[PDB]
């Protein structure tokens, strides 16, 4: 019922190998729907979901202009950042940006986000109030002072509470057959002996959307958090996600173990056992 829109920007410098590469991807929930890549033969915003293809050429043109300008701004930022950390021109560095809005079932703004990382570390973030900044270190305090003098937050806020929510609402309606559909996990438990006296039980969740899921094993109804091998939720490539959780059990005690699955697509949690 809740939804989000996010843009993710990455600029990577590469001294001796040209100017920094800029790439942006846009998501609604767990669905990517646009991309832009400054290394493309002819850089332009491109659709990556079916329900955004209907936007007119003025949409693609406008957004392409925006990304090209942003790429140039990120080049400036990367130069500034090297100075703020007393770094030489010889090393490669990364600037990441992520921003967007969360809305509830009624379409109303729940929370806005606008934040940055430099070489993988948090750098500066717009606070929840959308009026003030949190700087990670004295370099980022320089950015914060600049942005305070420029009243930079006011324009971020206007976008997050306005355009962001309005275009998210539009995308949700245009993509509603997919974006507002939860696909529940298809589940099953497998069993493989590892020795005469132990076996692996693996609980599988397949074909689910969105990616958020809880998969747990219990023994005699007690959570087995420490003893459970849990793989990171992974994309299948068909919009859906996969996950599994495994435990090693003494031979013959298999029926003491239950796998529990929670997902938005499930009315009630699933309890599963081997066979």
């Amino acid at each position: 019922g809740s939804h989000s829109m996010r843009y993710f920007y990455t600029s990577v410098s590469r001294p001796g190998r040209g100017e920094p590469r800029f790439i942006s991807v846009g998501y609604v929930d767990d669905t990517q729907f646009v991309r832009f890549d400054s290394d493309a033969a002819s850089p332009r915003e491109e659709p990556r979901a079916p329900w955004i293809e209907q936007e007119g050429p003025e949409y693609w043109d406008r957004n392409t202009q925006i990304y090209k300008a942003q790429a140039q701004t990120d080049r400036e930022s990367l130069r500034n950042l090297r100075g703020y950390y007393n770094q030489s021109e010889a090393g490669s560095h990364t600037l990441q940006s992520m921003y967007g809005c969360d809305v509830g079932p009624d379409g109303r703004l729940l929370r806005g986000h606008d934040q940055y990382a430099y070489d993988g570390k948090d750098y500066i973030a717009l606070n929840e109030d959308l009026r003030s900044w949190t700087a990670a270190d004295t370099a980022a305090q320089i950015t914060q002072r600049k942005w305070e003098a420029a009243r930079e937050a006011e324009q971020r806020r206007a976008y997050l509470e306005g355009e962001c929510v309005e275009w998210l609402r539009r995308y949700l309606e245009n993509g509603k057959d997919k974006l507002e559909r939860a696909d529940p996990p298809k589940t099953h438990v497998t069993h493989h002996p590892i020795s005469d006296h132990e076996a692996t039980l693996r609980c599988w969740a397949l074909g689910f959307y969105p990616a958020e899921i809880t998969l747990t094993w219990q023994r005699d109804g007690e959570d087995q958090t420490q003893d459970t091998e849990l793989v990171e939720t992974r994309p299948a490539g068909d919009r859906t996600f996969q996950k599994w959780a495994a435990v090693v059990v003494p031979s013959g005690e298999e029926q003491r173990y239950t796998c529990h699955v929670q997902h938005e697509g499930l009315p009630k949690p699933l309890t599963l056992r081997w066979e």
Partner: peptide, 9 residues
């Protein structure tokens, strides 16, 4: 759609 006129860091 993305935001524009964001300032440099």
């Amino acid at each position: 759609r993305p935001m524009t006129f964001k300032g440099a860091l």
